[PDB]
């Protein structure tokens, strides 16, 4: 299928092709795409969780972001 880990099964979790933290496919409008690793993250799964999608051009996930 498109994803060899979950075989695209909508009823299966997948941290590769869906939210990298929870594996959920819901709310794609709230899944930020990391501008380094291209993994998806629900705004609400992040720590800290964000109440809305950031305005800035680029976004980096917890695995890729530089130390603050």
């Amino acid at each position: 299928p498109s994803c060899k880990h979950c075989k695209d099964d909508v009823n299966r979790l997948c941290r590769v092709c869906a939210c990298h933290l929870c594996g959920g496919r819901q709310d794609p409008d709230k899944q930020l795409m990391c501008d380094e690793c291209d993994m998806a993250f629900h705004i609400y799964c992040l720590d800290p969780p964000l109440s809305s999608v950031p305005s800035e051009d680029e976004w980096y996930c917890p695995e890729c972001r530089n130390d603050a």
């Binding site: 794609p28 409008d29 709230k30 899944q31 930020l32 795409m33 501008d35 998806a40 999608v53 950031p54 305005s55 800035e56 051009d57 680029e58 976004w59």
Partner: peptide, 8 residues
Amino acid sequence: ARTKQTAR
């Protein structure tokens, strides 16, 4: 930021 899907 990019999202998996956008309103537009």
